[PDB]
Structure 1
Amino acid sequence: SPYSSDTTPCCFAYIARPLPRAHIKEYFYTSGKCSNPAVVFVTRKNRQVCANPEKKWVREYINSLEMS
């Protein structure tokens, strides 16, 4: 899927609270080019919830999460 002139799945603001990996289901790091890099924890509802790339606990949940 060559990205040229289309949409770009990214995040805007990061959640102000370490989403418990238990309530989260996964995480999707932004495409990597939208002035807002991060990791979108796709929780139970799986709403693409952002969580900030450098929020420390964020990476603690990324690795703790298993690529399903």
Structure 2
Amino acid sequence: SSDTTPCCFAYIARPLPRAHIKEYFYTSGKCSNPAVVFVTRKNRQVCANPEKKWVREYINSLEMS
């Protein structure tokens, strides 16, 4: 029920704890900066750099379900 789009303007500096992430999604291409959003169990939407190794690894684990 919202017309807004979540975008990222900064990336979290250190790897987020894997245990508390329930899913992820890529921010819209409309956004100026590319980004991966890790959603935590407390519904925090954390921005991360798609080029980081840990980020790609977390995505892989979330993709294997």
Which has the larger share of helix?
A: 2
Question: What TM-score range do you get, normalising by the shorter chain?
Answer: 0.7 to 0.9
**Cα RMSD for the two superposed structures:** 2.8
- The offset of 1:6, in angstroms, is 5.1
TM-score (norm. length: structure 1)? 0.76
Which has the larger share of strand?
A: 2
**Cα deviation code 1:12-66 (max 9, x no counterpart):** 1111111122121111211122221111100111211111111111010011014
State percent identity of aligned pairs.
100
3-state DSSP class of the match of 2:21?
A: coil
Aligned length: 65
Change (3 A) 1:26 1:34: same
Alignment of 1:1-68 (within 5 A): 7-66=4-63
Moved over 4 A (4+): none
3-state DSSP class of the match of 1:25?
A: strand
TM-score (norm. length: structure 2)? 0.79
Unaligned runs of 5+ in 1: none
